[PDB]
């Protein structure tokens, strides 16, 4: 019988590429989304046309709040309701914008969004993932990290704190959930898909920097590393974070 | 004119020892505390005994909440109020307890607020407020020695079982240390960390459990005293570390190097 | 047409498993060996029985010496003479033994030659020679076998540890320098894998216990699995990456 | 009694500033050099004019060879012979030049000479000096080793693989020796410059290119700023510190591509 996966922020871009590749591997998928309702059901439609009743949609804000644990518990619950199991969780959804230290949203909202999406939701989703299993199988969690986590971008401190917290969770959860046969790993893109709204010349500045090919990783290239980690080929791998960055983190100033 | 320093969680233990050594080095200090009012003022009394009006006290919960940015601004303000300047910020205050991922007291969101608030968010807001006050300073046109020192954890990559939120908070602190170091370098504000392995064990910990942790330590088979942690802090704030920023010094007696 | 791979120290254990999985994936293989002649040819015979003319054997000492560069050029040339190409280099051969700092009559300089040569310098020269011969339907890459415990070193293994650290450095330097040629350079870092046969089971179990995921060592095959991912089309953007295959061992404090 | 230190490659630049600061702190010093004889003897003279009988010179090639262990043993011996003790070893001497992985147009040296020089000076010599240092220990004291590492070690410069391998191996040694020598109270630490003193031969525009990369001040570290971290690590304010490598790089290693 088919395994099931939750992918967060799976409506488009890298999240969509992960849901799609997991689907092609034979997973049924919960496509989580926040604001991209149309893209999410459009994705689910295609996947369901491929194989009937193998994709459901689930919407949630993953900003930190007192109700976030409930939302995260529900996200996991939706996978079991639809599919009777939950074998894989991919923590992909992520708020991303600058927060300059020296001077719209209050700083506490930015805290809740940036740290919530990048670290607290992954933590809570991990708790619920594990709780639902215990209290053959190839259970694992993949966290979407950042290969530049130690060469941060200017004025992105909260985002960077969130990705760093995600490294800690990946390692803490790997260690703690190993007795249950739940493996916990990361995939760390460097420059992948640039923002839809980024000007082309700004995109080119980033591409130029990549030693391997002078270009960004495609969403499929990121998804490949994810499906390796969920596979039987990675049965012994846990607490490992795989850079998919084309050498970018190795390039000095 | 003597420089001034803010030290969070400075009433006891490592924070206290940092405050004492900064004061002995010539700093005026803001002693921040949460619950330890008695210890905070008795420290201030002692420092003020040595040099009149060189130690002041400041109370604040550093748990994340919608009033944290305000609280942290006021902490930095208290240093300018008392001493007319703020040269050094030491982020030492820290909540610390287990938070198991699997279950068989506080809600998990209270734990998040406390653990990531004290260890990461408050340091970040204090860093903002510290830097905002140095906005109109050109490091070329001045002879100051501004820095922040973040109290980290040498075991961040070999974490203790069931301490995931604490660990996330310390990881975020490493991220802030590095991000702030880069972003504030144009202001001549250096941002560094000191990472104890096993230092002062909890007062409530059984003596046999204490000795288990002590035995792990290759250099001397003992915990670091609070003074030895403070030595590294004062090096990092000193003129002999003027080119150091984004560095996290381990003070762990080799502990992080020991395999399972 | 079929790609070709060189695997150093390929007669036994992890190296043999890598050579086998590469061959199963469609690679022709050069099976390098040092002292394990019989094992090397029995492996070569087994793979050639599977598919004719897909396996050859190559003897070489990878200790550092004045002749080492020539040996390494010959190992690479060997793959080209046998198969007309060389798509993959796996640096697997490794000397491994204690060298205490404070006090088998091996001199320390022999220990240096053996431990640094096999783990670092031979990898570096094979990399030179590999790159030199390549100086686009191609997928060229190098995989170096590292050590997940490189920053939590075992007691009295300083030269070995220096060897492995130099290999990390080589992986990163070569990844950057060879990227313009489309040559990707990566690492697989076992923690506890195959234990020495002669080691007491009671000592083996001490190591096994340390491992969170399963309380067991990695099989050679599980290590080989990460190797074949790195060389595959599913890793075309991965260079300078070292993947731990350690079942969480490196995350366990003392 | 005054303590004693050995500093390798101490005739000039960073190694000199370390020898000077250790001398100013009250150490007697062995000034090791390879080619810089005049600068070495000139330093010994300045130090001796300040406090008589507190500085000696010792010449040795630290290229890897079958005689390197003897040479390193000699270097350590020279400290016990002059000063009756050896409290501090500073591994500073370092060969530094590109070794491209791909050749095209044919340099000077053979690749095995380059191996012997680059990894001998940066790694093997430090290892043997560490062996001899710990072996010779006699029996209030503060024994330590400081290794000069490199902050850019995981963001290597183009075509410097052998140099980078040496420096990576030196990290390994720092950590391994920290663990292994801890039971004897010998601490082993590192100082990692990013951009400090630029090569004399380097053109001014190239020098300015490196300087402008540094976030903290847009300048290189002086030799004295590097020596400061060294002297902190050998000091009593660092007695619980072992296996730590402190970056002195003005934030350079934190700058993305
Ligand atoms: N793209 C890159 O070059 C790159 C580089 C480094 C690291 N990464 C990591 O790789 C992963 C995917 O990258 P990406 O560029 O594809 O990410 P992205 O497009 O910026 O974001 C992915 C999804 O996250 C969801 N999200 C944002 N805020 C949310 C919130 N408040 N609550 C719930 N969901 C929220 C959004 O869902 P909706 O659209 O439905 O609202 C969004 O589509 C991320 O974790 C990222 O940090 C990517
Ligand atoms: N001790 C060790 O072995 C060790 C190991 C690794 C890292 N560290 C780091 O070194 C630093 C000092 O360690 P330590 O053991 O001295 O710390 P600690 O005793 O556990 O706590 C330090 C102080 O932090 C303050 N604090 C706690 N929760 C707070 C909150 N909600 N709001 C405001 N302040 C709060 C407390 O102040 P009040 O008493 O006034 O309430 C406390 O006295 C910490 O950052 C720690 O993480 C220590
Ligand atoms: N096994 C583990 O638990 C583990 C853990 C961490 C890292 N690793 C790494 O993974 C790789 C494979 O490990 P392993 O246990 O399979 O290795 P191994 O059995 O110790 O050695 C593999 C081969 O290296 C060859 N070799 C040794 N010295 C040589 C020299 N002088 N010149 C040429 N070849 C030489 C030997 O070839 P011959 O038999 O032909 O003489 C040997 O069969 C190694 O690089 C190792 O460091 C393994
Ligand atoms: N920007 C920087 O300068 C920088 C950056 C990162 C790391 N570092 C590290 O910091 C340390 C000091 O840097 P530096 O620039 O002052 O070094 P350097 O001037 O390039 O070299 C220091 C000394 O090493 C000695 N040496 C070279 N080859 C030798 C050999 N074959 N045998 C014995 N001695 C040999 C030379 O001594 P003689 O002159 O007597 O021949 C030289 O004076 C080095 O380890 C370096 O790698 C420096
Ligand atoms: C590598 N990358 C692509 C990119 C796109 N989406 C992402 N989304 C998430 N959640 N996380 C990522 N790290 C991410 N990265 C980058 C890198 C820098 C900037 C950047 O400098 N952003 C500025 C300026 C962008 C602009 O000029 O358009 C900003 O204010 O957002 C954006 C994307
Ligand atoms: C190294 N150390 C000392 C210690 C003391 N106070 C601190 N305080 C803070 N804020 N941060 C630290 N990391 C810290 N560390 C440790 C290490 C382990 C445990 C620990 O396993 N504690 C268990 C129980 C241990 C027990 O008391 O028996 C707990 O539930 O708190 C406590 C302190
Ligand atoms: C994880 N591992 C397995 C192992 C086997 N072969 C290898 N071979 C190589 N080349 N590299 C390795 N890292 C390696 N590792 C280990 C770990 C420790 C000891 C060990 O403590 N050996 C001591 C003790 C031997 C014993 O007690 O039986 C020795 O003196 O060799 C051996 C193998
Ligand atoms: C940071 N730095 C200064 C410098 C000077 N001496 C040293 N000496 C040693 N032993 N180790 C160092 N790391 C070192 N670094 C650098 C950085 C890059 C180049 C460099 O790109 N060198 C090229 C280009 C020289 C040029 O164009 O002038 C070479 O071929 O040597 C030189 C020095
Ligand atoms: Ni981190
Ligand atoms: Ni290394």
Residue numbers in the entry:
A (entry chain A): 2 to 104, 113 to 144, 151 to 268
B (entry chain C): 2 to 105, 113 to 268
C (entry chain B): 2 to 104, 112 to 143, 150 to 268
D (entry chain D): 2 to 107, 112 to 144, 151 to 268
From the article:
The functional tetramer displays point group 222, with two active sites, separated by approximately 25 Å, on each side of the assembly. The association between TbPTR1/NADP+ and MTX is primarily through interactions with the pteridine moiety, which is sandwiched between the nicotinamide and Phe97. Four of the six N atoms of the pteridine moiety make direct interactions: N1 with the α-phosphate group of the cofactor and is likely protonated, N2 donates hydrogen bonds to the side-chain hydroxyl and main-chain carbonyl groups of Ser95, N3 accepts a hydrogen bond from the 2′ hydroxyl group of the nicotinamide ribose. In TbPTR1 the C-terminal basic residue is His267 but the presence of Trp221 in conjunction with a chemically modified Cys168 (the corresponding residue is Leu184 in LmPTR1) occludes the presence of a solvent network in this part of the active site.
The protozoan Trypanosoma brucei has a functional pteridine reductase (TbPTR1), an NADPH-dependent short-chain reductase that participates in the salvage of pterins, which are essential for parasite growth. PTR1 displays broad-spectrum activity with pterins and folates, provides a metabolic bypass for inhibition of the trypanosomatid dihydrofolate reductase and therefore compromises the use of antifolates for treatment of trypanosomiasis.
